[PDB]
Design an enzyme around this catalytic site. Structure first.
Site, short mmCIF file in Angstrom:
data_model
loop_
_atom_site.label_atom_id
_atom_site.label_comp_id
_atom_site.label_asym_id
_atom_site.label_seq_id
_atom_site.Cartn_x
_atom_site.Cartn_y
_atom_site.Cartn_z
N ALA A 31 48.48 66.72 95.50
CA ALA A 31 47.77 66.37 93.92
C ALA A 31 46.15 66.70 93.64
O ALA A 31 45.68 68.11 93.12
CB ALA A 31 47.97 65.27 93.57
N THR A 64 58.35 67.85 96.05
CA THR A 64 58.17 68.89 95.50
C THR A 64 59.22 69.97 95.32
O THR A 64 59.30 70.20 96.58
CB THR A 64 56.75 69.02 95.44
OG1 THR A 64 56.18 68.37 95.09
CG2 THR A 64 56.68 69.87 94.60
C1 LIG Z 1 55.24 67.86 96.40
O1 LIG Z 1 54.29 68.82 96.83
C2 LIG Z 1 54.35 66.30 96.12
C3 LIG Z 1 53.94 65.96 95.33
O2 LIG Z 1 53.89 64.42 95.17
C4 LIG Z 1 52.38 66.59 94.64
C5 LIG Z 1 52.20 65.76 93.42
C6 LIG Z 1 50.92 66.85 92.12
C7 LIG Z 1 51.38 67.72 92.21
C8 LIG Z 1 51.15 68.39 93.53
C9 LIG Z 1 52.61 68.07 94.11
N1 LIG Z 1 53.66 66.08 97.11
C10 LIG Z 1 53.70 65.37 98.29
O3 LIG Z 1 52.39 64.91 99.00
C11 LIG Z 1 54.48 64.23 98.11
C12 LIG Z 1 55.53 64.15 99.13
C13 LIG Z 1 56.61 65.32 99.14
O4 LIG Z 1 56.25 66.65 97.89
C14 LIG Z 1 55.52 65.31 96.80
C15 LIG Z 1 57.08 65.13 96.33
#
Ligand SMILES: *C(=O)[C@]1([C@@H](O)[C@@H]2C=CCCC2)NC(=O)[C@@H]2CCO[C@@]21C
EC number: 3.4.25.1
Lengths: 198, 212, 244, 250, 204, 242, 233, 241
Positions: free
Chosen positions: B49, B1
């Site tokens: 999330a 993210t």
């Molecule tokens: C990013 O922080 C990320 C997202 O999947 C997540 C999804 C929706 C809103 C909050 C952010 N969080 C995670 O745990 C995954 C793995 C690494 O970062 C993500 C892509």
């Protein structure tokens, strides 16, 4: 940990605190003020666990202000520190203890003398000419043990600190982004906006 | 993210990516990482999330209740502290969230507050949160100016997310833009990183290392 | 149900008065008189022992003067047992304050707390109030010598000189007559005895019917000292002041 | 169910009297006379064993009770109220003192504890005051011998000698005549027996009278030896025989 | 990790002829780091003296607690508490925290105001009373203190002599302990007077 | 004495009935519901000329689509309003939608009989019934514009128009003849402004009286003094017109 | 007399009466009339809705407790909400835990027991509402009459409220007739309206004034109001 | 445990315990507050049933809730303390969570709520107190004056009085206070206040205390002399006619 330093000179207490706030891989802020004014003549600096640090400081601030209004009087520095020690000594045996260390610098208007208090998260309190929390003391205490004098002027205190900060910026592995300095004396608390090069 | 938010002359720019992963698995390339608390407040979501989505929507309800009770728009400081203090009540339980609370009030002006599940609450001008944060910070730090135009500011944010989407395996999908003015926030579209990359590459001349 | 037997100790009269408080005060008016006089160099607390016998042990007795702190004492007028309940909590509060701030509790703070406790029995709980009135004599470094008074209602006030219990009207008029801002402890001690002497419902005013205490700042020291006079000590001062 | 009597049953009347306390005192007045006398080296408390029937075994009902090895109590008023008060007193001597300081409480403090228990029955919700007056006699290292009286209000006062109950007025008067600050324990016992006679209608012997003293230490009543500092209880109830021996020199 | 080895410090009490002595170092450290050279570990309530080694925050809390308790005691009992009694108050107060104890090593010293008899006593962290007639040791250098005392001590020493003895015991034991020293203070106690002397020692 | 939740020999709850009496002594409040919105008006009735009339709040917003007027012991209505605001907001948080006006009303009326000294049914900790009636007006997709009268009895009725307070019997009689299924919002406004003037002790002006409405388009709004003053002038003219 | 023994439900009068309970029963009589009747295939509820003003609505008097059960109320509306809500939970419980629909007879016992608790303890008050419960379960169609006293009875038909006696005599007469209206809801409903109009006096049942509900063999408890009841007036 | 309904309705729709609470207010010493164009003044009268008091320590009638807000009252003193404490606590809590001090209306609505609550909770009697709350909203210069009573009702006033003989002094104010031109000066505002009290205090230099509140936490109480000076200039206004 962050840099928390305190020095009690002839007529004032000076507190220096690092401006950096690091969260993992990045330095999110380089202008953080790790202090709270508890009353017109009492300042508290703090360092420790991420959220606990400010929550504790503000909680203490609230209580002192409430006492000031109720009594229309300002508790002595010694009084405010015993209150704070007790709050931490309670916390140390609670479900989730406050992991916060503090320095309380105040000017006792009744005694007409500055006072510096060091209290760690266990509720360990001691009164000193100068003190610190974390690793800071390790690099600076030999400099303070050497140059410190009970009759130093506020100006001499700022010079001695500058020396401490330079040693810190030389041997300490982390970049704490400089310090914010505040003086507490008979006239209150003021910030030395010029230490980025004093 | 990758999520960012910065303050400037025209208010606040908010940009986020839209990728969701669980391990190496890409769960989604079209996830919402910005919560519209209300017409004047935006929240970014990094970390968990469910945690962000849930508590930021709840924040919205608390803000509304405030405005009904005080017949006055809630301050960004106050809205951010409601979330901050809620989160602090759960410290140690396992909540996972890195967030930016953004608003523009007459009393405060453009205001960004960083709030995480550790209980940290920080007011600042520029913030980047997420596994792609360092990439965005690189782009942001060297092109940020307080006197940027709303047009250029929007682009900088879009470009900074792009940088992160490219290098960070856990970032990508598309870019979601937002402009926050005292009269409210204005959505500025969804830009698929796929197409955005080639376009930016050609027009900008950057990403020279990638064969296009 | 039970409602049938509830006296309702905490309601207003049509005139807006609190029955129980009023009746408790009435109770207090039949209690031995207690006087409090504040001088420039100290405070004097004197009280008249209600009911006595030849067999009553006076050396081991104390029914009106109690030490709360090393800097605060009270004179009691009303139900002794009720007073003791309040005194003990007052003593605990003083220590809590000490342990928290590492400073002796300011006199007013302790008085306001005790009065607040009393006020409580006045607004909720359905219990009778304490049939007690206190005269507080204490010293602190913010206001020096202070004299206070608290009654069943939970109200408290400051005084240069005051009395509680029986014949307070007579006592107050006599005090307001001979009191003078620049008095001295010794003067006040004498005024106190004269006042009681003229308000007693008893024949004469002897030592076996009195309790006496003074809070002075012994010049040869620099600290505050409380002195609860002993039988013999009262007997002496009783002769000197010319009452024999 | 559930005690829904959470309001006071003792309240102030317009005159400032506390009805239930007064009535309780009246109950004390109808009770059998009891008394206590302090001597220079001891204290004596006594009362009459008003056997409610000849079939009753008066010994199985002690009006004089040991609270601590150096403190005893006697009363006038409602016997059942007294009994529970003794249980509560014995326990409080432990819970609020012996378990904290490792020694028994001094007479004034235990008296103070009892008084508190009584004061509460004067203000707590759903109860009536205790219908008794106690006379507690004891000894402790830093206060020597003492005698106290505790009334339904919870008030208590030290005495050199006094009486409570039925003929308290008469008895108190007779005591004022014979008491001096040079009485030896035996003298007080004597005076006590004389005073009690005027209050007794029928038989007057060691089986109709109950009398105890707080005096010297009774090492023979300790139950063990081997610890120099432990010399025995000062409290001792007199035996039927011991009383009669003294009644002959009446 | 060991709450009793974080701050360091020692206390020792000895009985003499119609007198008792209690001493302690003045150090307060945070592991290897010395923090204060004025952390006295001896306190008194009336004529009863209490030394306390262990976790500084608890040393401070316990002192505040016993002041509080001895104050109310005086108000009710109308006399100052005695050594034997205080010892029982200390014991029961510690045991009350049996499963979450204060990490301290208390030591009581004083003379009974009525019997004139000298008295010293030690306690483990959960109140077990150790009532020795000779000496009592406590702190991070307690092993060393036991060695010093066992050899240097003899019965019925006069005040002036006991002072020398207790001081040499404290001093040489502290000098074999990384966590002790940085100053010392000795209390010589008699029925009527009490003298407090600060000693001169290494500062490393 | 006698229980606070005792039945009279006629089958009524004393405290609730006595409650209705206090309500009769309150300032007048009127509500008119039309297919163009619902109007809600109240009588300020300040007790002295020094009292700043606009600090009199007898018409409050529950949510953008729900507002209400009160009559009686107004201080008793605060916790009711709070509960209502919380209920509507909570519903939105749980269902991502607006709370139906009827549902919101039913929620408020649920607090109603929660009084007593220990009534066996739950934990109704409240010593007496509320001493204030409420006129709750709003709009929702399923039943359009609505007006409800919530009483301390716990029952709530739906009305096309309704008046509560000191001049209710009189005002209600008026509404009976004036109301018809095709009133326009403007008509209802004048109409409410008119009836208030008839039952009010004082001469109705834009300072001792206040109007408000709720429309699907703009939601609940409280008319500012200038807006009402004009509507008042417009009424005087149409009345003097015949 | 009475005045000294009617201050609360916890007091028996010298003759063994419970006035508070009786005063509660009075609230029902002051309530608008409602009727209930059943054949062997269906159960019907006909209730006269009462209005405050001619500018007010006619308060709903029928509540659905489950897909196979429901009731009509006469008296304090709030108390019916509480009791019906409790009946809704009990039906829900039976389903969730035992995957069984709650027997109408069992519902009756549960209502009786809940009402009884409010007539033996200090502090509470009896419920001031009457209820007529209808439902189709594993033993057919059912009709129950609930009184705040805690008394619940199963009947073929009945009525409660003001002038209820009219309809009740009519049904006690029409018995042999309607009890056989099997497989024909409309006929049962009409018979219900004919019994209810036997308690009219003031006005005549109108469209926004009449309320009907039915349940049975292949008919989930459903409520008809307004236009939907027009074909019965 | 005690939860008897002390505040209930009577047949005529009244709640006597609240009504009687007002009677206790009537009995209390008079209090008045008037707002100028740039300040608010609070005046209170001092009883004289007994005089030989120590003015330094005896509790003052005007209390500060925060640095920008004050509260005066008429009624039971013991009761006022409970409200003052709760108000002071709520003031700090508000600053702690909203990061801004309370508005005067907010602080007032709070106190009022506590009062209202005590009128319908078991086991408690209403507060025999009525209050006047004045001050300046943070960063605002417009003066604020509010009043609360036992029932829990509250509202703002241009000027208002409570306590014994408040009937009298209110009349004075109603025919001596022009909303068109409020006392444009701290001086003329304090004067109008003293004048209103003299209608009932009957010559009381030591029986009349005044407190002046200006924007930005500027609050000060006048001394006997300062006030006595106002009285003097006022008795002349009369004699000079
Ligand atoms: C990013 O922080 C990320 C997202 O999947 C997540 C999804 C929706 C809103 C909050 C952010 N969080 C995670 O745990 C995954 C793995 C690494 O970062 C993500 C892509």
């Amino acid at each position: 940990m962050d840099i928390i330093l305190g020095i009690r000179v002839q007529d004032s207490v000076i507190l220096a605190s690092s401006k950096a706030v690091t969260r993992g891989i990045s330095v999110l802020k380089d202008s953080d003020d790790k202090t709270r004014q508890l009353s017109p003549h009492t300042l508290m600096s703090f360092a420790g666990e991420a959220g606990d640090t400010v929550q504790f400081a503000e909680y203490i601030q609230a209580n002192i202000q409430l006492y000031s209004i109720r009594e229309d009087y300002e508790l002595s520095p010694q009084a405010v520190s015993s209150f704070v020690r007790q709050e931490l000594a309670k916390s140390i045996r609670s479900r989730r203890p406050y992991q916060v260390n503090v320095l309380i610098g105040g000017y006792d208007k009744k005694k007409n003398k500055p006072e510096l208090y060091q209290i760690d998260y266990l509720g360990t309190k001691v009164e000193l000419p100068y003190g610190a929390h974390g690793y800071s003391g390790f690099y600076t205490f030999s400099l303070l043990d050497h140059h410190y004098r009970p009759d130093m002027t506020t100006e001499e205190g700022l010079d001695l600190l500058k020396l401490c900060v330079q040693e810190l910026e030389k041997r300490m592995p982390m970049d704490f982004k400089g310090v914010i300095v505040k003086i507490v004396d008979k006239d209150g608390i003021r910030q030395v906006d010029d230490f980025q090069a004093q | 993210t990758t999520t960012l938010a910065f303050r400037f002359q025209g208010g606040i720019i908010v940009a986020v990516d839209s990728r969701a992963t669980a391990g190496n698995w890409v769960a989604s390339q079209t996830v919402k990482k910005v919560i519209e608390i209300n017409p004047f407040l935006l929240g970014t979501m990094a970390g968990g999330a469910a945690d962000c989505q849930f508590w930021e929507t709840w924040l919205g309800s608390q803000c509304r209740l405030h405005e009904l009770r005080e017949k006055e728009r809630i301050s960004v400081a106050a809205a951010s502290k409601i979330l901050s203090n809620l989160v602090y009540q759960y410290k140690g339980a396992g909540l996972s969230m890195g967030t930016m609370i953004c608003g523009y009030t007459r009393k405060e002006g453009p205001t960004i507050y960083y709030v995480d599940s550790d209980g940290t609450r920080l007011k600042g001008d520029i913030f980047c949160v997420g596994s792609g944060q360092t990439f965005a910070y690189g782009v942001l730090d060297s092109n940020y100016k307080w006197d940027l135009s709303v047009e250029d500011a929007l682009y900088l944010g879009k470009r900074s997310i792009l940088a992160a989407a490219h290098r960070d395996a856990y970032s990508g999908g598309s870019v979601n833009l937002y402009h926050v003015t005292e009269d409210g926030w204005i959505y500025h579209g969804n830009h698929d990183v796929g197409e955005l990359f080639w376009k930016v590459k050609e027009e900008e001349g950057s990403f020279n290392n990638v064969i296009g | 149900g039970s409602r049938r037997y509830d006296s309702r100790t905490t309601i207003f009269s049509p005139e807006g008065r609190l029955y129980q408080v009023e009746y408790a005060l009435e109770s207090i008016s039949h209690a031995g008189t207690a006087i409090g006089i504040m001088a420039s160099d100290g405070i004097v607390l004197a009280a008249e022992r209600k009911v006595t016998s030849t067999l009553l042990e006076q050396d081991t007795s104390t029914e009106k003067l109690y030490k709360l702190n090393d800097k605060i004492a009270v004179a009691v007028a009303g139900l002794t047992a009720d007073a003791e309940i309040l005194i003990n909590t007052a003593r605990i509060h003083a220590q809590n304050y000490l342990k928290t701030y590492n400073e002796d509790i300011p006199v007013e703070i302790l008085v306001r707390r005790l009065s607040d406790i009393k006020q409580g029995y006045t607004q909720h709980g359905g219990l009778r109030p304490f049939g007690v009135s206190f005269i507080y004599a204490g010293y602190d470094d913010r206001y020096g010598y202070q004299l206070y008074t608290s009654n069943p209602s939970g109200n408290y006030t400051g005084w240069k000189a005051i009395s509680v219990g029986a014949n307070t009207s007579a006592a107050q008029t006599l005090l307001q007559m001979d009191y003078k801002d620049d008095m001295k402890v010794d003067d006040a001690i004498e005024l106190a005895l004269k006042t009681l002497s003229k308000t007693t419902d008893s024949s004469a005013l002897t030592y076996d019917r009195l309790e006496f205490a003074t809070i002075r700042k012994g010049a040869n020291d620099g600290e505050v000292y409380q002195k609860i006079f002993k039988p013999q000590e009262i007997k002496d001062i009783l002769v000197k002041t010319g009452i024999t | 169910m559930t005690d829904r009597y959470s309001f006071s049953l003792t309240t102030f009347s317009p005159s400032g009297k506390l009805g239930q306390i007064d009535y309780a005192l009246t109950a004390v007045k109808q009770g059998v006379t009891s008394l206590g006398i302090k001597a220079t080296n001891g204290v004596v408390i006594a009362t009459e064993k008003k056997s409610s029937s000849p079939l009753a075994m008066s010994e199985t009902l002690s009006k004089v009770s040991l609270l601590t090895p150096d403190i005893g109590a006697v009363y006038s008023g409602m016997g059942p109220d007294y009994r529970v008060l003794v249980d509560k007193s014995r326990k409080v001597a432990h819970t609020s003192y012996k378990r904290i300081y490792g020694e028994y409480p001094p007479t004034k403090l235990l008296v103070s504890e009892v008084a508190k228990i009584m004061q509460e029955a004067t203000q707590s919700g759903g109860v009536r005051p205790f219908g008794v007056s106690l006379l507690i006699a004891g000894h402790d290292e830093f206060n020597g011998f003492s005698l106290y009286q505790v009334d339904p209000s919870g008030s208590y006062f030290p005495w050199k000698a006094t009486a409570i109950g039925k003929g308290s007025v008469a008895a108190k008067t007779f005591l004022e005549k014979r008491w001096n600050d040079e009485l030896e324990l035996e003298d007080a016992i004597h005076i006590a027996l004389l005073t009690l006679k005027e209050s007794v209608e029928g038989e007057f012997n060691g089986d109709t009278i109950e009398l105890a003293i707080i005096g010297d230490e009774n090492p023979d009543l300790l139950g063990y030896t081997g610890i120099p500092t432990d010399k025995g209880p000062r409290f001792r109830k007199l035996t039927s025989q011991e009383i009669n021996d003294r009644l002959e020199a009446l | 990790s060991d709450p009793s080895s974080i701050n360091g410090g020692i206390v020792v009490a000895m009985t003499g002829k119609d007198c008792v002595a209690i001493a302690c170092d003045l150090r307060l450290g945070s592991q290897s780091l010395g923090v204060s050279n004025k952390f006295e570990k001896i306190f008194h309530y009336g004529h009863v003296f209490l030394g306390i080694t262990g976790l500084a925050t608890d040393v401070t809390t316990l002192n505040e607690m016993f002041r509080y308790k001895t104050n109310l005691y005086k108000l009710k009992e109308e006399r100052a508490i005695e050594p034997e009694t205080f010892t029982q108050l200390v014991s029961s107060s510690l045991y009350e925290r049996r499963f979450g104890p204060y990490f301290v090593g208390p030591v009581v010293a004083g003379i009974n105001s009525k019997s004139g008899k000298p008295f010293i006593a030690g306690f483990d962290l959960i109140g077990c009373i150790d009532e020795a007639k000779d000496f009592i040791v406590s702190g991070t250098a307690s092993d060393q203190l036991f060695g010093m005392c066992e050899s240097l001590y003899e019965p019925n020493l006069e005040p002036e002599d006991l002072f020398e003895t207790i001081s040499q015991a404290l001093l040489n034991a502290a000098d074999r302990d990384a966590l002790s020293g940085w100053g010392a203070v000795v209390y010589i106690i008699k029925k009527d007077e009490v003298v407090k002397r600060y000693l001169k020692m290494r500062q490393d | 004495d006698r229980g606070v939740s005792t039945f009279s020999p006629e089958g009524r709850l004393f405290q609730v009935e006595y409650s209705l009496e206090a309500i009769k002594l309150g300032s007048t409040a009127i509500g008119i519901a039309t297919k163009e919105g619902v109007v809600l008006g109240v009588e300020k009735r300040a007790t002295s000329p020094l009292l700043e009339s606009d600090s009199i709040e007898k018409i409050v917003e529950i949510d953008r689509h729900i507002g209400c007027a009160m009559s009686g012991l107004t201080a008793d209505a605060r916790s009711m309003i709070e509960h209502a605001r919380t209920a509507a907001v909570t519903h939105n948080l749980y269902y991502d939608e607006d709370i139906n006006v009827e549902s919101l009303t039913q929620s408020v009326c649920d607090l109603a009989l929660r009084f007593g000294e220990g009534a066996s049914g739950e934990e109704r900790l409240m010593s007496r019934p509320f001493g204030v009636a409420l006129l709750i007006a709003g709009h929702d997709a399923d039943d359009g514009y609505q007006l409800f009268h919530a009483e301390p009895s716990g029952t709530f009725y739906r009305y096309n128009a309704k008046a509560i307070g000191s001049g209710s019997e009189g005002a209600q009689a008026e509404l009976l003849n004036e109301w018809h299924s095709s009133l326009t919002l403007k008509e209802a406004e004048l109409l409410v402004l008119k009836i208030l003037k008839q039952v009010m002790e004082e001469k109705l002006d834009e300072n001792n009286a206040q109007l408000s409405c709720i429309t699907k388009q703009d939601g609940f709004k409280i008319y500012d003094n200038e807006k009402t003053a004009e509507l008042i002038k417009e009424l005087k003219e149409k009345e003097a017109a015949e | 007399f009475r005045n000294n023994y009617d201050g609360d439900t916890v007091t028996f009068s010298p003759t063994g009466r419970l006035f508070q309970v009786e005063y509660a029963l009075e609230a029902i009589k002051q309530g608008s009339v409602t009727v209930g009747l059943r054949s062997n295939t269906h159960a019907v509820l006909v209730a006269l809705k009462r209005n405050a003003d001619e500018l007010s609505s006619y308060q709903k008097k029928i509540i659905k407790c489950d897909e196979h059960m429901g009731l009509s109320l006469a008296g304090l509306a709030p108390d019916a909400r509480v009791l019906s809500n409790y009946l809704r939970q009990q039906c829900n419980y039976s389903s969730l835990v035992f995957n069984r629909k709650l027997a109408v007879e069992r519902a009756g016992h549960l209502l009786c027991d809940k009402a009884q608790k409010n007539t033996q303890s200090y502090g509470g008050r009896p419920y001031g509402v009457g209820l007529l419960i209808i439902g189709y379960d594993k033993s057919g169609a059912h009709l129950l009459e609930f009184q705040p006293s805690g008394n619940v009875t199963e009947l073929y038909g009945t009525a409660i409220g003001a002038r209820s006696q009219g309809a009740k005599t009519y049904l006690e007469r029409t018995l042999d007739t309607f009890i056989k209206i099997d497989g024909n809801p409309d006929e049962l409903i009409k018979a219900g309206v004919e019994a209810i109009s036997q308690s009219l006096r003031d006005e005549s049942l109108t469209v926004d004034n009449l309320s009907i509900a039915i349940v049975g063999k292949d008919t989930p408890f459903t409520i008809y109001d307004g236009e939907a009841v027009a074909k019965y007036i | 445990g005690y939860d008897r309904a002390l505040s209930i309705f009577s047949p005529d729709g009244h709640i006597f315990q609240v009504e009687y609470a007002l009677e206790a207010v009537k009995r209390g010493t008079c209090a008045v507050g008037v707002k100028g164009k740039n300040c608010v003044v609070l005046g209170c009268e001092r009883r004289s049933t007994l005089k030989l008091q120590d003015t330094r320590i005896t509790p003052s009638k005007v209390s500060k809730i925060d640095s920008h807000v004050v509260l005066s009252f008429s009624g039971l003193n013991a009761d006022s303390r409970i409200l003052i404490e709760k108000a002071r606590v709520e003031a700090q809590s508000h600053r702690l969570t909203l990061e801004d001090p309370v508005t005067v209306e907010y602080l007032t609505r709070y106190v009022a709520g506590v009062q209202q609550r005590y009128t319908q909770s078991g086991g408690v009697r209403p507060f025999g107190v009525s209050t006047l709350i004045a001050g300046f909203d943070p960063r605002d210069d417009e003066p604020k004056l509010y009043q609360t009573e036992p029932s829990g009702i509250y509202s703002s006033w241009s000027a208002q009085t409570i306590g014994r003989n408040s009937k009298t002094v209110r009349e004075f104010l109603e025919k001596n206070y022009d909303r068109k031109e409020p006392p444009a000066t701290v001086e003329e505002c304090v004067k109008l206040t003293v004048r209103s009290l003299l209608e009932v205090v009957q010559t009381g230099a030591k029986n009349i205390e005044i407190t002046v509140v200006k924007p930005d936490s500027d609050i000060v109480a006048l001394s006997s002399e300062e006030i006595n000076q106002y009285v003097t200039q006022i008795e002349q206004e009369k004699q000079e006619q």
